Structure formats: C-alpha cells, structure tokens
Amino acid sequence: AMAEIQFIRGINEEVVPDVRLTRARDGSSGQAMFYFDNPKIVQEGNLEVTGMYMVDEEGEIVTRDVNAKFINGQPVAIEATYTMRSPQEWDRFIRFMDRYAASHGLG
Amino acid sequence: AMAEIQFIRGINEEVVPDVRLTRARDGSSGQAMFYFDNPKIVQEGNLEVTGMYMVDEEGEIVTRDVNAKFINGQPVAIEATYTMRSPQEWDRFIRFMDRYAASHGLGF
C-alpha cells in the first residue's frame, strides 16, 4: 500500500527521485542511489535535513549519507546513498522499493 | 525460477546489470537503463544480439534499444534502454523488476 520517502520525519517528499541500483561483483554488497531534482524540502523545509527515511508498513529504512547540492548559495538538489551489506538488507529494501515504485507510477 | 534477463531468447544472462530508473516530472513516461559489465553473451560472443528480453511468470517484456558499449576501443559491454509510455507498462515492469531483483540478491 502506502510507501513514502521523507527528508524530515512526518513529511512525505513530493518529488520522485532518479534511482540507481548496483550490486557488487562478488554479490557481497549493493547500493541504491537517489537523486532528487529541486525537492520540496529544499523549498525552505525549513528544518535541517539529517537523513532520508524510507517509510512503509514494515517501519523505516534509514540512511545518513545524504547531501544537498548548492549553486550560488541555493540548495538545488539532494543526493542520497543507501548501502546494503546483507541478504536481509537487500530483501528489505526491494520490498520497500516495490511498494514505492508501484504507488509512484505513470499518469 | 522467478525472473531472468536474456540477450538471446532461451539463454539467461549471468551478469547482473547496473539499473537506473527515471520518471518524467509530469508523470507522462518512464525509463529504465541497463549497464552490463562484460556480460557472458559478449565473452562467448557468437550469436548477434537484436534485443533484450525480460522474462518472468507473466511472459516477456522486450526492448530493441540495445547497444554494444565500447571501452578503450573494445565492445566489452552492453547498454539497454526500456521506455514506458503508459501506467500498464510501468506497473508490469515494476512486477518484473521486483522478481528479478529479489532473485538476484546478495550472498555472504
């Protein structure tokens, strides 16, 4: 059902990110990269962003590797990276992404 | 087995691609782009690749937009793009991608 991404807890981000998914050659680890073009939270959030929260029926998945991009003093974008080091983390993440991509589809 | 990717129909590709998923800002279209680093079909390198086939319990999803990718003058890799123009196409592709990613996961 409901799956969302939040930069501040309790606030769902409207902008849909580009998502890049990689898997290590030996199958030991994986990475999901999110790139947000002018996300609402930058439009004067106004609260400082300390993490990204992937929120669904199971709870949260959390990454602290999150960085705003600035041009001439203005945050214009956000990049986030989520690294998975175990089968359980990979499986948990795919479940979230499915719920997210399905409720974030085309018109 | 749930889902596989094929360059030649009937042969499952062993190399797992890097995958990039985009959505147009107005929600009108979406795109998935695939990067295969030296996929077996290139290493063994006999049959000519005319398409990429995404195969699962529901059937196949197909794209003809598939290209040899060169590194230092050598066709060592493949790029593919699958474009979705409708809600039906998006939802169906997400179903494949779930099954593929779930059966292509991590070891120890």
Curated annotation (Swiss-Prot), chain B:
**Where in or outside the cell is it found?**
Cellular thylakoid membrane
Species per Swiss-Prot/TrEMBL record: Thermosynechococcus vestitus (strain NIES-2133 / IAM M-273 / BP-1)
Q: Which family, according to the similarity comment?
A: Belongs to the Psb28 family.
User: Which example biological process does GO assign this protein?
Assistant: photosynthesis
Quaternary structure and interacting proteins, as annotated = Part of a photosystem II (PSII) assembly intermediate complex PSII-I; crystallized from a strain deleted of psbJ, it forms monomeric PSII before addition of the oxygen evolving complex. PSII-I includes 3 assembly factors not found in mature PSII (Psb27, Psb28 and Psb34). This protein binds to the cytoplasmic face of D1 and D2 (psbA and psbD), contacting CP47 (psbB) directly above the quinone b-binding site.
Protein's membrane topology: Peripheral membrane protein
Q: Which UniProt keywords apply?
A: Membrane, Photosynthesis, Photosystem II, Thylakoid
State the Pfam families in the record.
Psb28
Q: What is this protein called?
A: Photosystem II assembly factor Psb28 protein
What the entry lists under Gene3D superfamilies is as follows: Photosystem II Psb28
Disulfide-linked positions:
none
The family database entries (HAMAP family) matched by this protein are listed as:
PSII_Psb28
Q: What functional role does this protein have?
A: A photosystem II (PSII) assembly factor that binds PSII during biogenesis, protecting the complex until water splitting is activated.
Q: Which Gene Ontology terms of cellular component type are present?
A: photosystem II oxygen evolving complex; plasma membrane-derived thylakoid membrane
Principal place of residence: membrane
Task: Report if keyword Membrane is assigned.
Answer: yes
